[PDB]
Amino acid sequence: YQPTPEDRFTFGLWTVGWQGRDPFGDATRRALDPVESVRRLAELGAHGVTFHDDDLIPFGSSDSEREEHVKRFRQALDDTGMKVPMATTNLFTHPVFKDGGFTANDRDVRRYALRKTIRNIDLAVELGAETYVAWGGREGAESGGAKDVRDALDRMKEAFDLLGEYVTSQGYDIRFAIEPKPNEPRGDILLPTVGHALAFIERLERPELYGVNPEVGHEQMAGLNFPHGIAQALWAGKLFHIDLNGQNGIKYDQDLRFGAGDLRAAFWLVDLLESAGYSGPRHFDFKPPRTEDFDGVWASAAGCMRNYLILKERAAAFRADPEVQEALRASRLDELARPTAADGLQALLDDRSAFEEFDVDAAAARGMAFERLDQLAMDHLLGA
Amino acid sequence: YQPTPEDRFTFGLWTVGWQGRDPFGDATRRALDPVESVRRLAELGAHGVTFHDDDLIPFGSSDSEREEHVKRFRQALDDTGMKVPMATTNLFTHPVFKDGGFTANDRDVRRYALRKTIRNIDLAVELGAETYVAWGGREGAESGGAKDVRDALDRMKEAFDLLGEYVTSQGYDIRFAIEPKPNEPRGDILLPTVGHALAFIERLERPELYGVNPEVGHEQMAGLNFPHGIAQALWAGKLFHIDLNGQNGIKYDQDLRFGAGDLRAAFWLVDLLESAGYSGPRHFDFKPPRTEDFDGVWASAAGCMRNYLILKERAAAFRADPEVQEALRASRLDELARPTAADGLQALLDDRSAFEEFDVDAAAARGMAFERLDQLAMDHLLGA
Amino acid sequence: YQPTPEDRFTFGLWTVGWQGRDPFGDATRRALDPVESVRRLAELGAHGVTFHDDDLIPFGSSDSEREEHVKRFRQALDDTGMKVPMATTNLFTHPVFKDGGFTANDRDVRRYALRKTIRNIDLAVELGAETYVAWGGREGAESGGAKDVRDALDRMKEAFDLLGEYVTSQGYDIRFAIEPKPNEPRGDILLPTVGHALAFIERLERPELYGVNPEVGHEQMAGLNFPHGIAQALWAGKLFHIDLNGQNGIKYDQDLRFGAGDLRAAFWLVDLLESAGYSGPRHFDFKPPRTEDFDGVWASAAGCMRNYLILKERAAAFRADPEVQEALRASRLDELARPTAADGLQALLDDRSAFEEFDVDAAAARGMAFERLDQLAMDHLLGA
Amino acid sequence: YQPTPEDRFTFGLWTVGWQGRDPFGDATRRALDPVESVRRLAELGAHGVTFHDDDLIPFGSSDSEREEHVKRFRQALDDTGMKVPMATTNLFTHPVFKDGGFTANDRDVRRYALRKTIRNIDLAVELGAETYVAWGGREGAESGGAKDVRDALDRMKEAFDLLGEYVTSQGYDIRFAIEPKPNEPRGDILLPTVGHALAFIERLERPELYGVNPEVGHEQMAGLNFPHGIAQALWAGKLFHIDLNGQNGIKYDQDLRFGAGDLRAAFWLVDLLESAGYSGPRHFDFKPPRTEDFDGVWASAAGCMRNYLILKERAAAFRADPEVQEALRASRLDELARPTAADGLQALLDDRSAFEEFDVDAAAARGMAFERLDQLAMDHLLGA
Ligand SMILES: [Mg+2]
Ligand SMILES: [Mg+2]
Ligand SMILES: [Mg+2]
Ligand SMILES: [Mg+2]
Ligand SMILES: [Mg+2]
Ligand SMILES: [Mg+2]
Ligand SMILES: [Mg+2]
Ligand SMILES: [Mg+2]
């Protein structure tokens, strides 16, 4: 189960680089030099890395220091063959963003947030990134009167529209992906789920430039079915990028390694991505637990990729099995794929087999055979 | 705090009529005659009633029996002055719908589901309803392989598109509202939140005909902020109808009377509906607990309206208070309403006050004053 | 992976017999004759069956009808070799129990609840049951003023104390197990978790007669770690019985087949039960989904046992693996088993290696190696 | 609604002193000198302060520095009249505690954890504290194999037993209170709820020395009813201390000011504490949101006390109202307080009115009148 760069596994600098500071504890690990992270991830079989601006260039750095940091980074990429498919902006760590970036109540903060983003879009394009992610982690509220959400949505739309105008005017080939999260660090975060983000995109001036970057653990923080949500994003043509990790239910954002947390959900996610032919990066946004030393960090990162690859093999075996194909027909998955009324409205209304002469009791008595199908799925997942 | 029909409070027949059967217990109350419910609700100050087809006309009724039931209903409406602003279809109780109506795997069930709906749209228009609600309570799955969600979304779109074609072809003045719910009675339900429903509407052929009918308790079953979600629906121009009730957190759908459950959320909801000038019905989808006799049913229904009216008075007092208006300015709610960059992109990029000379430490040191504002809100809610 | 009666798998009559009525839908399956259920479960490899009084003897049955029903049941047990290890009382379905049985506000209902229980304890002993379960599903409240919980706990204690006096006075060899649940069908249920039930037992007059009967899905309805809770019950010597099923997170009680829901939790549960040598029944309290016909019911029941047996094999392989044993030592599980201060308090206080000369930075730098251990656990679960 | 020191409101140094570092952001406020916090809280009407060792004496401080810090603290207490009713140990911030203190897998860490605690018990007694709190925030796991929970419970018991031996041997008048939390910062924390902590205490060698210190938001992080849990702790005689704050549902630990979050739960909590005559401190463990400057910190702290006092007045008015007293009788709260069978077991068995001649249908038809009672409670809460 060995990864190759052709599997398109990517990692954020801030994942393996997380020093282990949590709300109640100090860091347990020294900081990693981004150049060291690039080399070590390349040795494990990764395809590329991602970054927030502030991960790569320390906040407040001089232009000269900024040049030096980018140059050393670019050399490690050249030395390893690693790519940078995605970048993003840190609009959440600095105290100035304590009430948000794009939807801060203070107008001068919103303007600064936009300028900070634009500078990193330029860098992202220079380094080859094809997706620019936005996680509005500070966009929200702890109390009801602090944020008029209609006004905040106007400001969020205004910011994204200005970014679309900028990339169009520069001629950049880059698309945006909004990353939803329901809460943490704000009591409630705006655009809390994949559905809310998808809905918001349709009100932007250039909707074609915007998709979603869903994260396993975030949708599970609302108790939602992550494969279902990904299916709706694919149906809408908006799955531009994805963040893979694990989460044990409705609690703080754990960012466990992929495969941890809800294992069956991970199986059904991989089944869907592979069946739909998703071609983008398989990005891991995870934190190696602070219990670990650096050997544990790399073991956790390796496990992310390993578990994707085991699940890929088991999902493929499931769909290839003639006994499963026959169970899918027994459960009428084939009929769900057929139109309800390709004959048209008037035909349906005149069809007495659809109402006047329909035997509801005979249809009702038919079992769906779903438990047999699901146990075949379980057997395949477990290799039994 | 006495309701009048001008407050536009409405109730479903199935609310005060709930007999108290739950997953673990038999009914505790006899069935109510819909004509009795109309008379009693009119005496309490309600404006109108809503219904599922099967609430009004028993399933399997003959055409003649159907005529008789509608006539007796219409007479109670004439006798009381009660209106019927909304109607809906029962696509969840009968065993035939056990895998869904619009997205059942069996094609003949989907066709029957559509014909059953169309028949009740005709009745709805005859009785004056201006909104037709769809709650796809059986649309979903307990297991991953049972439902290909992309195919199910194609079938859901196909059904709603056919309904839009029908109402257009008949010339009816009626709009559709989708009611989201995350789970129960299915393990996961399709279009689980307001955001997912809003996103789905934008892919229909005639999006103008479709909005949402959110329910307090349903969004709270995903741990989401209901006023925030309603703000996004209003921003999108899609809040066609609303279902008011109470819910204590993430658990089974309790359908408590409005004001019960999360009281502060109820305050912020009423503040928003009144400030935005929402003009539709204030519909209660609640269940009087099965501990109650019929006196308790009417006391619970009365409490729904009473609590809306107390919260309305307190929210109005909050917004009218000069001390609150001054706190809103101190927290820069006025600046959140102003454009970030009405001067345009090029101006922003050339503005050195927005980045090069912005003092982040001075902006960061400014308190938001949100706790003082929220305690003023609390004081107003509690009458202190 | 074929079950034998020596695996001690048991099923409640009400599980495979569930007709599929849920809050929003009618039954989808005909009722099963308990004699048919006993025969079919015996053919699948089950060891025994359990029952509520009202599952076996219809409520209101005459004494003569009661005799006939017990006789036919006993004959199926004799014909199949099936045992009845556990029984329980239905104190939740009938409307009289709408505010509880043992803690109903009405004193005459509490007295009836006790008499109904006592009658079935006699029957339970006659049929050989060694554990009597109590699930107080109606003991609780939807509102704060309806139930003084201190008074309700006095009444709960009074009821259980009287039952202990009864079984002692009759000389019966039977022990009680309390089954906790946090909510549903009441808004909040008394003794909501394993911890609360354990705490309550220590205040009874004869604590030795009482243990717990935890259920996978119930503890997961509070977001709690079920293996952890079972570990505390075993530590207390109180795990008298267990209910196995599956649950997808914090929502209504799904009662999925065992292995469904949180698969990793199921693995860690089986690892614990087998390592601790739990010797009681492996009882499944599950509902075959209402989508299923009777073939699906038996397929779901079979899957319960199958999944226990696959997980048993994988957990045994995990603990037998020398590479895992070495990882357990690397993570110092061996040191967690050793006393902290068997040398005593005075020794510890005089030990300068424990404080004055302890190198906190050297201890802090040691990795715990937990991610490597967990990936070995994952590899074993998946057969990789 | 002005607080006095006789209302026994207390605050932890770490509450108003929280600098605003969260998982995703830097501090927004400078550190507060504990002497300044004591003076400012005394001016607001507080009765006292609490502390972790590391809040008062910086970790690694020399003995001489330790003396100086305690002396300056003691002078502010003398100058203000503030008391120190409770103290606790920080066994969670330093990296050495990354796998726990009392239940760390490393034996030398467990020994250090005990020595660190003992040193602060001595200081606590010197400063007058009557309760010593333990929050085992690092006691737990992110993965199943990392912690054998039976062994960890043996180590937890061993630690608490040694602390009881120490305080007995020194002759100290101090009692212990365990503070439960279900998760955060560990994926699952041992003794996750009030019930689990109560159960664990009964296995200690000197149970009389140990109670609980429940926290509003922690029990609500498991979706549990906090007043119910407090009622069970009072019933057990174990409510030694309480932590008051607010929490919006099942998510990260928000530590909002008291009254925020679930307002009705706060009303029912205050009703219970006052009715039961709880005489200990009303301690606030809350965090002023990081959006706030120092004026906002003190406004948030003031709001904690204000909201307790408003709720106290409304709960007293509720219980004093003759119309409520009559509703309580109508709902048979008086009968819930009466014994079920003070006549004894034999009497109950011979009483044909309890079973043979009991009219279940007549009892079942009686309404409980709970909705009328609850609306009277709502009316009183809102001042209507
Ligand atoms: Mg995350
Ligand atoms: Mg992410
Ligand atoms: Mg509902
Ligand atoms: Mg509704
Ligand atoms: Mg259950
Ligand atoms: Mg059970
Ligand atoms: Mg807390
Ligand atoms: Mg606390």
SS (H, E, C) C267-310: HHHHHHHHHCCCCCCEEECCCCCCCCCHHHHHHHHHHHHHHHHH
Tell me whether strands C282-284 and D188-189 are parallel, antiparallel or unpaired: unpaired
Q: With beta carbons less than 8 A apart as the criterion, state whether B22 and C185 touch.
A: yes
Tell me whether strands B86-88 and B48-52 are parallel, antiparallel or unpaired: parallel
**Rounded to 10 degrees, what is the CA torsion of A198, A203, A209, A212?**
-20
Residue type (1 letter), B322: P
* Resolution of the solved structure (Å): 1.5
Residue type (1 letter), B47: H
CB pairs under 8 A between B and D: 124
The DSSP letter of residue D321 is -
CA distance B183 to C35: 35
Element (H, E) at B304: helix B294-320
Tokens in use for B360? 């982040």
Centre of ligand 2 from the C-alpha of residue A135, in Å? 8
B361 is in an annotated binding site: no
Residues of C whose CB is below 8 A from D206: none
CA-closest candidate to residue B82, choices B5, B183, B196:
B5
CA-closest candidate to residue B27, choices B303, B284, B301, B292:
B292
Which protein residues have their CB within 5 A of the ion that is ligand 2? Answer: A 215, 243, 285
CA distance C124 to C49: 12
Q: Is D331 helix (H, G, I), strand (E, B) or coil?
A: coil
Q: Is B194 helix (H, G, I), strand (E, B) or coil?
A: helix
Cβ distance of B370 and D296 shorter than 8 Å = yes
**Rounded to 10 degrees, what is the CA torsion of A220, A224, A225, A227?**
-70
Cβ distance of D195 and C195 shorter than 8 Å = yes
Torsion angles phi and psi, residue C284, rounded to 5:
-105, 115
Count of residues for chain A? 384
Tokens in use for D132? 């010593």
CA distance D226 to C117: 30
Torsion angles phi and psi, residue B39, rounded to 5:
-60, -45
Can you name the residues that pair with D141 across neighbouring β-strands? D188
Cite the annotated binding site of C by residue number.
179, 215, 218, 243, 253, 255, 285
- The chain D residue lying nearest C358, using CA atoms, is D112
What are chain D's partners, defined as 3 or more CB pairs within 8 angstroms? A, B, C
Q: With beta carbons less than 8 A apart as the criterion, state whether B268 and B276 touch.
A: no
Centre of ligand 5 from the C-alpha of residue C285, in Å? 7
CA distance A17 to A256: 14
Residues in chain D whose beta carbon is closer than 8 A to a beta carbon of chain B? Answer: 1, 28, 220, 223, 249-251, 257, 259-260, 262-264, 288-289, 291-296, 299-300, 302-303, 306-307, 310, 314, 364-372, 374-375, 378, 381-384
CA distance B105 to B89: 19
Cβ distance of A228 and B335 shorter than 8 Å = no
CA distance C156 to A99: 50
**Residue extents of the structural domains in chain D:** 1-384
B53 is in an annotated binding site: no
Q: What is the DSSP track for B115-161?
A: HHHHHHHHHHHHTT-SEEEE--TT-EESSGGG--HHHHHHHHHHHHH
Residues in chain D whose beta carbon is closer than 8 A to a beta carbon of chain A? Answer: 20-28, 92-95, 97-99, 137-138, 142-143, 146, 182-185, 187-188, 221, 248, 250-254, 256, 260, 289-291
Closest-CA distance, A222 to chain C, in angstroms, reads 10
Tokens in use for B137? 């309570």
- The chain D residue lying nearest B311, using CA atoms, is D382
Q: With beta carbons less than 8 A apart as the criterion, state whether C245 and C217 touch.
A: yes
CB-based contacts of C314, cutoff 8 Å, min separation 6: A382, C267, C380, C381, C383
CB atoms within 10 A of CB D147: 27
Alpha carbon distances (Å) from D110 to C338, D106, D155? 11, 7, 9
CA A38 to chain centre: 21
Q: Which residues of B are catalytic?
A: 52, 55
Active site residue C52: yes
- The chain D residue lying nearest A220, using CA atoms, is D251
Nearest bound ligand to the CA of residue C243: 6
Q: With beta carbons less than 8 A apart as the criterion, state whether B238 and B280 touch.
A: no
Tell me whether strands D282-284 and D9-12 are parallel, antiparallel or unpaired: parallel
CA-closest candidate to residue A304, choices A223, A250, A242, A253:
A242
Q: With beta carbons less than 8 A apart as the criterion, state whether C43 and C81 touch.
A: no
Q: Is C188 helix (H, G, I), strand (E, B) or coil?
A: strand
- The chain B residue lying nearest A149, using CA atoms, is B231
**Rounded to 10 degrees, what is the CA torsion of D36, D38, D39, D40?**
80
> Helix D263-275 to helix D294-320 angle, to the nearest 10 degrees?
60
Can the peptide bond before residue B322 be classed as cis, meaning omega within 30 degrees of 0?
no
Place of tokens 């935890």: C214
Q: Burial level of C93, CB count in 10 A (0-12/13-18/19+)? A: middle
The DSSP letter of residue B176 is E
Cβ distance of B142 and C221 shorter than 8 Å = no
CA distance A134 to A162: 14
CA-closest candidate to residue A234, choices A271, A203, A292, A277:
A277
CA distance B299 to A167: 60
Q: What is the DSSP track for B229-250?
A: HHHHHHHTT-B---EE-B--SS
Residue type (1 letter), A181: K
Q: With beta carbons less than 8 A apart as the criterion, state whether D233 and D212 touch.
A: yes
Element (H, E) at B202: none
CA distance D171 to B163: 81
Q: With beta carbons less than 8 A apart as the criterion, state whether C130 and C88 touch.
A: no
Q: What is the CB-side half-sphere exposure of residue C258 using CA atoms within 13 A?
A: 30
What are chain A's partners, defined as 3 or more CB pairs within 8 angstroms? B, C, D
Tokens in use for A65? 């220091």
Tokens in use for B215? 């329910």
**Rounded to 10 degrees, what is the CA torsion of A315, A321, A324, A325?**
110
The DSSP letter of residue C215 is B
CA distance C89 to C104: 16
Q: With beta carbons less than 8 A apart as the criterion, state whether B85 and B10 touch.
A: yes
Q: With beta carbons less than 8 A apart as the criterion, state whether B234 and A150 touch.
A: yes
Is the dihedral angle over the CA atoms A291, A295, A299, A301 positive or is it negative? positive
Residue type (1 letter), D350: D
The angle subtended at Cα C374 by Cα C369 and Cα C379, nearest 5°, is: 130
Cite the annotated binding site of C for Mg(2+) by residue number.
179, 215, 218, 243, 253, 255, 285
Residues of A whose CB is below 8 A from B158: 339-341
Element (H, E) at D324: helix D322-330
Among D375, D376, D379, D381, most B C-beta atoms within 10 A, so best to mutate, is D375
SS3 per-residue string spanning chain A = CCCCHHHCEEEEHHHHCCCCCECCECCCCCCCCHHHHHHHHHHHCCCEEEEEHHHHCCCCCCHHHHHHHHHHHHHHHHHHCCECCEEECCCCCCHHHCCCCCCCCCHHHHHHHHHHHHHHHHHHHHCCCCEEEECCCCCEECCHHHCCHHHHHHHHHHHHHHHHHHHHHHCCCCEEEECCCCCCCCCEECCCCHHHHHHHHCCCCCHHHEEECCEHHHHHCCCCCHHHHHHHHHHCCCECCCEECECCCCCCCCCECECECCHHHHHHHHHHHHHCCCCCCEEECCCCCCCCCHHHHHHHHHHHHHHHHHHHHHHHHHHHCHHHHHHHHHCCHHHHCCCCCCCCHHHHHHCHHHCCCCCHHHHHHCCCCHHHHHHHHHHHHHCC
Q: Burial level of C311, CB count in 10 A (0-12/13-18/19+)? A: buried
Closest-CA distance, D293 to chain C, in angstroms, reads 34
Q: With beta carbons less than 8 A apart as the criterion, state whether B293 and B264 touch.
A: no
Residues of A whose CB is below 8 A from B249: none
Q: Is B111 helix (H, G, I), strand (E, B) or coil?
A: helix
Q: With beta carbons less than 8 A apart as the criterion, state whether D228 and D146 touch.
A: no
Active site residue C283: no
Residues of A whose CB is below 8 A from C305: none
CA-closest candidate to residue A288, choices C381, C369, D149:
C369
Q: Is D383 helix (H, G, I), strand (E, B) or coil?
A: coil
Tokens in use for B169? 């072809």
CB-based contacts of D320, cutoff 8 Å, min separation 6: none
Among A220, A252, A293, A300, most D C-beta atoms within 10 A, so best to mutate, is A252
Tokens in use for D214? 């429940």
Q: Is C119 helix (H, G, I), strand (E, B) or coil?
A: helix
Q: With beta carbons less than 8 A apart as the criterion, state whether D164 and D174 touch.
A: no
Tokens in use for A114? 């936009």
CB-based contacts of D296, cutoff 8 Å, min separation 6: B367, B368, B369, B370, B371, B372, D288, D289
CB-based contacts of D14, cutoff 8 Å, min separation 6: D51, D52, D55
Closest-CA distance, B256 to chain A, in angstroms, reads 21
Residues of A whose CB is below 8 A from B116: 355
CA distance D223 to C78: 46
Residues of B whose CB is below 8 A from C98: 20, 25, 28, 290-291
What are chain B's partners, defined as 3 or more CB pairs within 8 angstroms? A, C, D
Residues of D whose CB is below 8 A from B250: 223, 249-250
CB-based contacts of A370, cutoff 8 Å, min separation 6: A331, B141, B142, B143, B145, B146, C289, C291, C292, C296
Q: With beta carbons less than 8 A apart as the criterion, state whether B114 and B155 touch.
A: no
Q: With beta carbons less than 8 A apart as the criterion, state whether A193 and A219 touch.
A: yes
Q: What is the CB-side half-sphere exposure of residue A132 using CA atoms within 13 A?
A: 26
Q: What is the DSSP track for C126-140?
A: HTT-SEEEE--TT-E
CA distance C76 to A303: 52
Residue type (1 letter), B190: L
CA distance A152 to A150: 5
Nearest bound ligand to the CA of residue D178: 8
Residues of C whose CB is below 8 A from D99: 368
Torsion angles phi and psi, residue A322, rounded to 5:
-60, -30
CA distance B11 to B284: 5
Centre of ligand 8 from the C-alpha of residue D185, in Å? 13
CB pairs under 8 A between A and D: 107
Count of residues for chain C? 384
